[PDB]
């Protein structure tokens, strides 16, 4: 029964998931001045041409758009990664106000929202096996600032009215995730974990330096979703983000100067 409230929020997670106080926990504050520029980092290979979405689902914490990951259709290569990573699903973390919502911060700067494209390493067979390996997952974090509208996001926004409550799902085919990327693929990378329970420490994080712009009307329909299920008292799905965690014995690396 974890959530983002007062009595089950991220401050209560360690009592049911003691790994929450682990070494490689996410998110963290990306200090751009201590981030070490690594010239040995290859450019990110974002191959989303043959991406095949299936369904968008409200799971009571966010909304996931699920992709067909039984083949190499939308993969992420290069960068700090060794091998191939299949795109399985993506989700957003947003806040009740435009000055908060992102899980990662850039010099303590909180963005309005953060997009998380979750991938799993193909050399482990499926997602359930990849989460149990330190190099099993790779999430492509992308910040969202409130400005001009993002066209490629409009299909996701218009379908949120059909998945208002927890447990609701709807067909979501032929969505291109390439429309959610910024112009530049400069990134920071560091070893981390899932930012939600079970908080498994298995994620290679890739956080793009450049954010994407979305309109206030686009993010205002994120905030119309509900944590609760149908027929229950309404609790708006806002502030579904985990605050930063101690970096501890970790060095964040950059692909740019
Ligand atoms: Zn996430």
Curated annotation (Swiss-Prot):
Documented effect of changing residue 64 to Q: 2-fold decrease in enzyme efficiency, as determined by kcat/KM ratio, and efficiently inhibited by chlorzolamide
Modified residues (Phosphoserine): 162, 169
Outcome of mutating residue 103 to D: Normal CO(2) hydrase activity
pH dependence: Optimum pH is 6-8.
Swiss-Prot/TrEMBL catalytic activity: hydrogencarbonate + H(+) = CO2 + H2O; urea = cyanamide + H2O
List of catalytic residues: 61 (proton donor/acceptor)
CDD domains (alphabetical): alpha_CA_I_II_III_XIII
Residues that hold substrate according to the record: 195-196
Effect of residue 116 to D/N/Q: Reduced activity
Effect in UniProt of substituting residue 116 to E: Strongly reduced activity
PROSITE patterns: ALPHA_CA_1, ALPHA_CA_2
UniProt-recorded Gene Ontology molecular function terms: arylesterase activity; carbonate dehydratase activity; cyanamide hydratase activity; zinc ion binding
Site (Fine-tunes the proton-transfer properties of H-64): 4, 59, 64
This protein's UniProt keywords: Acetylation, Cell membrane, Cytoplasm, Disease variant, Lyase, Membrane, Metal-binding, Osteopetrosis, Phosphoprotein, Zinc
Function: Catalyzes the reversible hydration of carbon dioxide. Can also hydrate cyanamide to urea. Stimulates the chloride-bicarbonate exchange activity of SLC26A6. Essential for bone resorption and osteoclast differentiation. Involved in the regulation of fluid secretion into the anterior chamber of the eye. Contributes to intracellular pH regulation in the duodenal upper villous epithelium during proton-coupled peptide absorption.
Illness the protein is tied to: Osteopetrosis, autosomal recessive 3: A rare genetic disease characterized by abnormally dense bone, due to defective resorption of immature bone. Osteopetrosis occurs in two forms: a severe autosomal recessive form occurring in utero, infancy, or childhood, and a benign autosomal dominant form occurring in adolescence or adulthood. Recessive osteopetrosis commonly manifests in early infancy with macrocephaly, feeding difficulties, evolving blindness and deafness, bone marrow failure, severe anemia, and hepatosplenomegaly.
Protein name (record): Carbonic anhydrase 2
